[PDB]
């Protein structure tokens, strides 16, 4: 049993989002905060042309749609889209604030998560500023063995993902992601057969 989160919830509207449905549209007015009760979502952004890019996946326990909560009339900073089907807690900017001064512990929990997210995001910049593409892929393959939905597998951690997607993560062409994977396979670093992949030497 966990009281602080339990009390928080006793003040929210619950709403189910079907897989691949869009929870937050970049640009919209921001007046509301969301909380992932169950599932996993995708945080992405888009250029004028429509090319997409994945910042991070959030899972049960993680907060979403907070950035407007500190300055007024701010606009949503990125798409947030349901990876699986999600059940989501919702609560207003108006009311969340009333809550802080009742139990700041709750603001802490959000804030805790904020910080970690800056670290990840900062790092991804580093991935981009310093590593070649063959390299950026590597980092991202390891980060995946860290995720919840990652499966234990004899040689190391097993994951399910497309090349097309990996591109939205590492910022390169899908054709390119394919090419490295055939190389990483000669180099016995991975076992790749379909959306199905074995990451040797994690776990």
């Amino acid at each position: 049993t966990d009281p602080t989160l339990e009390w928080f919830l006793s003040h929210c509207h619950i709403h189910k989002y079907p897989s691949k449905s869009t929870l937050i549209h970049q640009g919209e007015k921001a007046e509301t905060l969301y909380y992932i009760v169950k599932g996993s979502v995708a945080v992405l952004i888009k250029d004028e042309e429509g090319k997409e890019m994945i910042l991070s996946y959030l899972n049960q326990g993680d907060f979403i749609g907070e950035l407007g909560l500190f300055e007024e009339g701010q606009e949503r900073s990125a798409w947030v889209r349901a990876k699986t089907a999600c059940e989501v807690a919702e609560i207003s900017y108006k009311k969340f604030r009333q809550l802080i001064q009742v139990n700041p512990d709750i603001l802490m929990r959000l804030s805790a998560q904020m910080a970690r997210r800056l670290q990840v995001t900062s790092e991804k910049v580093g991935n981009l500023a310093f590593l070649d593409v063959t390299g950026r892929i590597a980092q991202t393959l390891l980060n995946l063995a860290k995720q919840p939905d990652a499966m234990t597998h004899p040689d190391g951690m097993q994951i399910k993902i497309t090349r097309q997607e990996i591109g939205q993560i590492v910022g390169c062409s899908r054709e390119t992601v394919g090419r490295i994977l055939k190389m990483l396979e000669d180099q016995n670093l991975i076992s790749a057969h379909g959306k199905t992949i074995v990451v040797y030497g994690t776990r």
């Binding site: 499966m151 234990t152 597998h153 004899p154 097993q158 776990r203």
Partner: protein
Amino acid sequence: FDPILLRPVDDLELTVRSANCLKAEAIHYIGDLVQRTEVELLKTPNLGKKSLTEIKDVLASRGLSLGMRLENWP
């Protein structure tokens, strides 16, 4: 060493379907289970997503999980 890992599979109180696959794969003690991998278990006949899921949940509310890496066995 550790205490829960010396108990029989029976101490997990599984369903008949989950219980019957474990006892037919030569997985007798809970210490044997936590070492086994998620993908490996799934290949075994009569064991599908829901049984694999029951196994992962009876271990999780009890501290443990799959694919654990252990020493000093027997």
